[PDB]
Design a protein around this ligand. Sequence first.
Ligand SMILES: [Ca+2]
Ligand SMILES: [Zn+2]
Ligand SMILES: [Zn+2]
Ligand SMILES: [Zn+2]
Lengths: 160, 165, 160, 165, 160, 165
Amino acid sequence: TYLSWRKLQLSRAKLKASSWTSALLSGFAMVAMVEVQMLIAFAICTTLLVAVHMLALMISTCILPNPHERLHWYIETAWAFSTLLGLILFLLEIAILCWVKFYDLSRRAAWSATVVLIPVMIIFMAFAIHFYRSLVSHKYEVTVSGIRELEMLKEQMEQD
Amino acid sequence: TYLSWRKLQLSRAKLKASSWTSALLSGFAMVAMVEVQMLIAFAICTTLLVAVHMLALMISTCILPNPHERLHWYIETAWAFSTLLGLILFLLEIAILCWVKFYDLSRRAAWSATVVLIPVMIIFMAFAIHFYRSLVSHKYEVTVSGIRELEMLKEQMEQDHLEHH
Amino acid sequence: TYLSWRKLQLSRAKLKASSWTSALLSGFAMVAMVEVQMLIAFAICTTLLVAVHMLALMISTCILPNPHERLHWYIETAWAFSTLLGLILFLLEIAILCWVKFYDLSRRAAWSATVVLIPVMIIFMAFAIHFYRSLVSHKYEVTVSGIRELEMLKEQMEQD
Amino acid sequence: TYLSWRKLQLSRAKLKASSWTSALLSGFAMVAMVEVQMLIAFAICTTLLVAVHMLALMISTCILPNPHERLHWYIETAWAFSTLLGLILFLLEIAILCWVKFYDLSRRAAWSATVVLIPVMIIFMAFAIHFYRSLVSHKYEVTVSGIRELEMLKEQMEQDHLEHH
Amino acid sequence: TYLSWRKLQLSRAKLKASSWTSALLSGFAMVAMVEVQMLIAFAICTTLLVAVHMLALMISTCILPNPHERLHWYIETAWAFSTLLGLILFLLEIAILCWVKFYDLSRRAAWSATVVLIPVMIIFMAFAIHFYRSLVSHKYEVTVSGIRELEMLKEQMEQD
Amino acid sequence: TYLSWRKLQLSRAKLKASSWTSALLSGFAMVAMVEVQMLIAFAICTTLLVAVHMLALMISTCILPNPHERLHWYIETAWAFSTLLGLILFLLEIAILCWVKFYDLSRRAAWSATVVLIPVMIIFMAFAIHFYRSLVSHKYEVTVSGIRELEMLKEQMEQDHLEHH
Ligand SMILES: [Ca+2]
Ligand SMILES: [Zn+2]
Ligand SMILES: [Zn+2]
Ligand SMILES: [Zn+2]
């Protein structure tokens, strides 16, 4: 009873927070584009960021009406993946904006900013990979896949 | 009990999230329009986006007071459809904006962006179609359904009144 | 018990969502006016939109402290009516803004936009009428009024 | 039990909605002022609107920790009054803005707008009056009420301390 | 049980509302500064306002993990004090902004606005004093301090 | 029961407030950057502020699905640290902005502002240090902790599968 209650309250706080950030990010970004008015990058990025988020939101329109377990994990992962694509894209977007503001003014600063992004982009890229790998395949293989990837790490910290 | 409780908490998280995003998207889009100040597209899109979203919001003004099951599913669906059209229109809106910001500067970028949207637009359009199809069909079933509930309400006042003497 | 609990939680989600959208719409609209700076229309519209919403909000200041049934339905309908007037006015406002942005630039587009609004404005106008008719009169007459309006529709779908 | 529970959930939805709108209106109005950049009016209004709303917010900082009944009703009323003044000031603020945007361009529109407001302003002013009247009256009752509660708190520590030995 | 439940739900509505307003005020103010671009005042004010609020927010990062009673009242008061400093600073900020907008245009209006602020600033200053006095010292002294300050008032209303 | 309930409601209010402020700060800062349009500082700050906050948000995407205790504390801490860095970066961001708005106009004000920040920055930095120190240490403990939980999950499917015949 406590488990089913906790699971349902988690889907409910996830719903409220998903719609929340998806809409606020999407909006703040659209406004960021009209306020300033590699450029193919800026356009595909803004546009992709808003589309990916609208996807997540719709996944919040449809999880509400809806064995059941396998379908709910596929939808859940599709939501989490669309959302993560949204955070990455929002980051890429701020990179491209430092770029666009600084292009004709200071190249050093712009390049510095887009660069400091790489390690975080790595962590982000990493997780996007786990959710994608989780989407096509079934829980087991990815569960073991995960144990392998973690165990190979257990060997590194000890050596040091 | 757990089922009726979960259903009610789902209409309640759906209410709070619906009003939320409808107002934030609508407001943000209107502001996006005034800030820049093929064009017939931009106007019809902004205006349609805001009208469709206000429709969703009102569906949150009226689900609150509310056999009942068929009528509540129709209304819920009118909400999901208004909401989804709003998402589509918002996406369309950001496309036309890349278009408008980039028109005289770089045609390549705008067209590239407007193109990469197509797979997502496909999924969105698909669902818009299913929801539309659910509405047109029960236009019959529901109207009646609503009559039966309103009648029962007219009858519940008649009984409640017969006891006052 | 479940009924009184559901009614109270509905007044509580309605409170939180009312204040939410009333304030966000009002604000977004005020900002839309200062950012651009038939015109009598634009002014009466912005001004009416913010006033109607502030009304709704105050109805959320006063439902909190408060047979009881008849008074709570009159207040509820006053809130719902002020709120609906707010959504319509927000729509009229975006019409007038396409108008104001496009006036000297492209008349075709502006007129097209204010026009596509009419069927939705019909549905909106319709509901504004039900709430107003509910405000002056008592539940019964409007309940029957509603059955009549719906039954006369039942005859149309069959013929086709 | 249901009554005390409902009362507490009402102070809790009132808290969350108060802070909500106070911050959004205040912020949005400040931004409305800097974006345009009879005038004495515009300044006193923006500044009063933001001060009155910050008052409401603080009343949400202090209701959280809190015979008790009289003091809690006074504070609740100080909140409702600060809140209502904020709504009035926001309305006044949008009027002065139609005024300021339209001044040199079209006098007719601004005056028309500032006029249609009058019935709504009447209702708002009315309530502002009732709440003000509730405050001035119990300035006496409550101060004492607060003393009695603070004393009882001083006494509850004295008893709680008498047992430590 | 009802008491511990109410206390916990109060810390929970305080958390959600604190983060809410702290972030919205901070943001609206930063944006107010870049949109316009005694001045030492404007800078120290904007900067202080955002710092004080970020403090409150972090106090919402740390109250979540955490006799216990004395520590929770010191943290609670630190949060309430940072928050109050934030509201005052937001007000001072709007004063300084009327100032900055009106300086070269109408001195009368600017001075009028910063002036109408004083009585409210008094109430604000008053409360900031109670929370500061509560931070350094223990509950008792401040509790009695409070009874004294209130009782000396009881004598004034009667005379009139 | 009350303890597990309180812990779960704390992760739930922390989730809702985390996503809340992360998105509002990030969006507001990006907009602050485009509106003005030593400089290497401004860019790295805006970009770092938005990246760190998106990190926090994602930590709200992943706490939802989730011995367990050690792994949940590590993740919670990664969240608190990403969140705190975000607050620091936002403060740094408003400093560099006073700097940038005031550079050619009044040097005195900008420097005064950037200076008064130092005590607050001290407290923030301090906590950033404690959280960082909690992370680096358990890099060992947790990875293993996670393995043990994932294994147990691999084992729970194996048992659940052994019964299907
Ligand atoms: Ca601008
Ligand atoms: Zn009779
Ligand atoms: Zn003793
Ligand atoms: Zn087998």
